[PDB]
Design a protein around this ligand. Structure first.
Ligand SMILES: [Mg+2]
Ligand SMILES: [Mg+2]
Lengths: 445, 445
């Protein structure tokens, strides 16, 4: 009924996301794409998950059973697929991965020919075919059967395109890489060695079991240690499929996606390349990122959470740069989806154009402290309105006067509500939250 | 109910032999083998059929969904699989091919750990699982899932083993190869170039569509032309999966499996290596092959048609050499199934040990002429007994007195009977058949 969430088709591999489903996906999916060509060119990529092989085989089988021309890519980052499908006029690109999730999980994600996600009505038709119980789709025979020519060389192409967006050799910079034991493990090390940086690596020994196991964008603490240990200029932590980037300065502090977006968009404005000097972001972004934008004369468009809205916003009005705090950054001049390595190169560009250390460049955006307090309440759903709670909030907001932010949303999992403040100091956070919290306890408990 | 015929699982690819079935085969097949190891090592090979890829993917998926360790071999001859599985203590070997059949057809064939076909009771259990409508077999998750390490280097191993059975370099011999555009296309050319023979090739440009297309063991007429055209010492014509060999002499005449068996078994007797100086063959063999055996003091055991009986016979009583007229020859000292390249090397061994041309060596076995006549009859099933027909046959037989043979068997397809004589001359054939034929017309018509 719905197999395509916001990440395409996800599940625990073999339990929920069965090789049986990956076959029907590939078989019906290639049908929906058979309205263009009747030999649609389709690219498959995967990350280093052990189940990728089981799913790639079953999925490739379905694509060849309706006549699609299949191009195995091997293990490559999701950006690589997006770039490659558009750069080789393919009708689609599939990526088998579950990003930063644990190893038992896998997923199937589709790209149409433009390098963006598959159109929402195309995904619709697929789902409507997978709920009929009788496959009456064609079964080509003999030479009408699908044909496979592998392209394990495609990584080298994507690599050479990234290398061409480097403004100059990164000589003299000692960089440390955490590749999450995932899709970027071989790509990243070849990319930065080839730009003549000094490269120390970790999380680059994938074996099908160890993806995002205390490594990668979402477990940056290890890379923090490894940078201080090897006295590196910075650390780069991609996630399992290479669409996120989180950095680490020479002093070992985490540099999140808000700060990277700041650092780079300010670099692009400095070169005339940021278009309309605007930057698209989500509501997930820290208040002091907007503050830092106004102080550098960069307008901002804010959207709802989710890659699809950030990219839709940039597309409508020609925007050059977008991103979320998670490390997902889109440089629409170069690639149609978030690209960890691309982010990394723009970051390195800034490091060598300004000669400053990454500590200093991340300083120029002051993050506002946040504070969460969880109030157990009897019925968490009748606080949306309340003359005493909704009042104390509006009071607290205008008092802040744009140098702070409130958010109160009932938990879904549990019988409690989450009160969260951003302010310019931890102490303003404490009081602002405690005002709202103590009147919430006045009703429920 | 029965999916495993004498060639394992055959069908037209995607119509009858669907990627769906290849999945259940791989999934249930690896289960039946999970009673040994619970991570059974399984080898897959294939020929150059375009559908091999679709079936290999689906089949590999099923093997990984019950935890088998899968070793893709790439394209390799059926002998290669048999040799390799036994030489690497694997629990099974799968070969995806349909031999000499047209390209739209494919098949799945299983080898147990000994390098012989899977035990007949193991194949039984598989079939009994594929007729239950509810897969309640395990579904390992996470690291319990199957694991794949490719071994495309395995051809080079099989190649180096064959190269070690060559009694000496084949220098000075100009050999022509017809590889049917199949599994032996890359193996054969590297093997004979490496033994320093002068090598002309044809049917070695496979593209997934052109397997056994007027080339290979069963269409030898092209290789006949190509040998005369390039003035070669001999031609070798393997079939689609490399288990058959048919040769061609310098004058362009076909040398069938009876004659190869003769030529080689006489060579092995000459070196003390033919064991009990016996040779196993089928009833399909030409009468003058037996005659030629008695004249060289080689005993013979004769069996029913089918690889499985020839190999069972050799196994019971330790026999060294066996084979059918089709080119399928077993050299149990070296490999557990028919091996085209192996046959070829034994043949080359003889050519260089005796210095004679292949014309002369094939001369020493005089084939008896055969003759078939087809008699339309009203009910072809009441000639098994007939006082007038069964009498004229016994008469004709004892007259021949062991220098001839009769066979009369009703056609299945049609309303007629086939009368077939072997005699020492075409004229004895003509009369012997016409006697039997004219009394058959005396009843039916
Ligand atoms: Mg991701
Ligand atoms: Mg064969």
């Amino acid at each position: 009924g719905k197999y395509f969430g916001t990440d395409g088709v996800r599940g625990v591999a073999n339990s929920e996301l069965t090789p049986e489903l990956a076959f029907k996906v590939g078989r019906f999916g290639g049908y929906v794409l058979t309205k263009d060509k009747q030999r649609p060119k389709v690219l498959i990529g995967r990350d280093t998950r052990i189940s990728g092989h089981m799913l790639e085989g079953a999925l490739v089988a379905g694509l060849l059973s309706i006549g699609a021309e299949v191009m195995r890519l091997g293990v490559i980052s999701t950006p690589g697929v997006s770039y490659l499908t558009k750069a080789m006029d393919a009708e689609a690109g599939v990526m088998i991965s579950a990003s930063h999730n644990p190893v038992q999980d896998n997923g199937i994600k589709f790209f149409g020919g433009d390098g963006f996600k598959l159109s929402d009505e195309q995904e619709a038709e697929i789902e409507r075919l997978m709920d009929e119980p009788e496959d009456k789709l064609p079964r080509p025979v003999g030479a009408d059967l699908g044909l496979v020519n592998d392209y394990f060389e495609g990584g080298q192409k994507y690599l050479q395109f990234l290398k061409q967006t480097a403004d100059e050799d990164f000589t003299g910079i000692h960089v440390a890489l955490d590749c999450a034991n995932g899709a970027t493990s071989s790509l990243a090390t070849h990319l930065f060695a080839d730009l003549d940086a000094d490269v120390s690596t970790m999380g680059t020994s994938p074996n099908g079991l160890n993806i995002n196991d205390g490594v990668g964008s979402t477990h940056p603490e290890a890379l923090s240690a490894f940078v201080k240990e090897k006295n590196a200029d910075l650390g780069l932590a991609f996630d399992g499929d290479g669409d996120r980037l989180i950095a680490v300065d020479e002093k070992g502090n985490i540099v999140d996606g808000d700060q990277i977006m700041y650092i780079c968009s300010k670099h692009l404005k400095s070169e005339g390349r940021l278009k309309d000097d605007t930057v698209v972001s989500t509501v997930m972004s820290n208040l002091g990122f907007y503050k830092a934008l106004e102080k550098e004369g960069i307008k901002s468009v804010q959207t709802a959470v989710g890659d699809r809205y950030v990219v839709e916003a940039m597309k409508k009005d020609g925007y050059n740069v977008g991103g979320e705090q998670s490390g997902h950054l889109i440089f629409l001049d170069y690639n149609t989806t978030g690209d960890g390595l691309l982010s990394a190169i723009m970051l390195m560009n800034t490091l060598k154009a300004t000669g400053k250390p990454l500590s200093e460049l991340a300083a120029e955006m002051q993050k506002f402290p946040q504070l969460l307090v969880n109030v157990r309440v009897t019925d968490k759903y009748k606080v949306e309105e309340n003359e005493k709670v909704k009042a104390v909030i509006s009071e607290v907001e205008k008092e802040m006067n744009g140098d702070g932010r409130i958010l109160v949303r009932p938990s879904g999992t549990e019988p409690l509500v989450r009160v969260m403040a951003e302010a310019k100091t931890k102490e303003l956070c404490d009081e602002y939250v405690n005002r709202i919290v103590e009147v919430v306890r006045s009703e429920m408990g």
